């Protein structure tokens, strides 16, 4: 038996909304540490890592590590049937051939019980090695989303230039071009060892911002010629972290 109770069930709702539009299927590593999910999109241009620590749950049970193959699209439609105040419970027998979601409306006079089949997905744990980054920008998650939405009306790619005093976002298209400059100090905090300048697909960046409902601040960590990290903290649970290979 694996069983995990989350009183703030909306976190799950907002995680499945942040993932369903970018990956279709994904393997869920269930262990004593909790939940871990790593997964590239279908074109291998980006990487999603979700951590939900078992201490972030309110009831956590694990007899045995599980590699739960999840159709995120099925889990998303099921999670759309939970109310924002519901108490969500995930449960799987040690067989791991179906996954159960239980939404207890807090009044306790309403209890939904959904159930989906799990599939065999191997855990290609292949991961990004932890590392220093040249520029780490911490900023309100809403602003990063508006920056990305704005610029994608101009062009397909954004140029992120980051100094000590400021980070710039730029796009060029047929229309014209735009640049958005942010100065330091919610608010904006830049930690620079070296200036970086990197190009990225706004298309993919706009998938990531679907995570904005999980936290008021996002961090962008970037170095030269390596993927960008967009990290959303899931308060008292862990993080959801998106990686995007660059254009060169």
């Amino acid at each position: 038996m694996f069983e995990a109770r989350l009183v703030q069930g909306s976190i799950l709702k907002k995680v499945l909304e942040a993932l369903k539009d970018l990956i279709n299927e994904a393997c869920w590593d269930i262990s004593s540490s909790g939940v871990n999910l790593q997964s590239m999109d279908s074109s291998h241009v980006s990487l999603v890592q979700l951590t939900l620590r078992s201490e972030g749950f309110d009831t956590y049970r694990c007899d045995r590590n599980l590699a739960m193959g999840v159709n995120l699209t099925s889990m998303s439609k099921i999670l759309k049937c939970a109310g924002n105040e519901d108490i969500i419970t995930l449960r799987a027998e040690d067989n791991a051939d179906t996954l159960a979601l239980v939404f207890e409306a807090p009044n306790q006079e309403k209890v939904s019980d959904y159930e989906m089949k799990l599939m065999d997905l191997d855990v290609e744990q292949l991961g990004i090695p932890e590392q220093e980054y040249s520029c780490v920008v911490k900023m309100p998650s809403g602003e990063f989303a508006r920056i990305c939405r704005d610029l994608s009306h101009i062009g397909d790619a954004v140029v992120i230039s980051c100094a000590k005093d400021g980070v710039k976002f730029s796009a060029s298209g047929e229309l014209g071009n735009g640049n958005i400059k942010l100065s330091q100090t919610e608010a904006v905090t830049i930690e620079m060892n070296e200036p970086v300048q990197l190009t990225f697909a706004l298309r993919y960046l706009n998938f990531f911002t679907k995570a904005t409902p999980l936290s008021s601040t996002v961090t962008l960590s970037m170095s030269a010629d390596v993927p960008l990290v967009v990290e959303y903290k899931i308060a008292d649970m862990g993080h959801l972290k998106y990686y995007l290979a660059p254009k060169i």
Binding site: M40, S43, H44, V45, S46, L47, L126, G127, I128, T199, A201, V226, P227, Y243, L244, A245, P246, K247, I248
Partner: peptide
């Protein structure tokens, strides 16, 4: 121009 994430794993 678009690199894949595969190189960096």
């Amino acid at each position: 121009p678009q690199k894949l994430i595969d190189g960096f794993l």
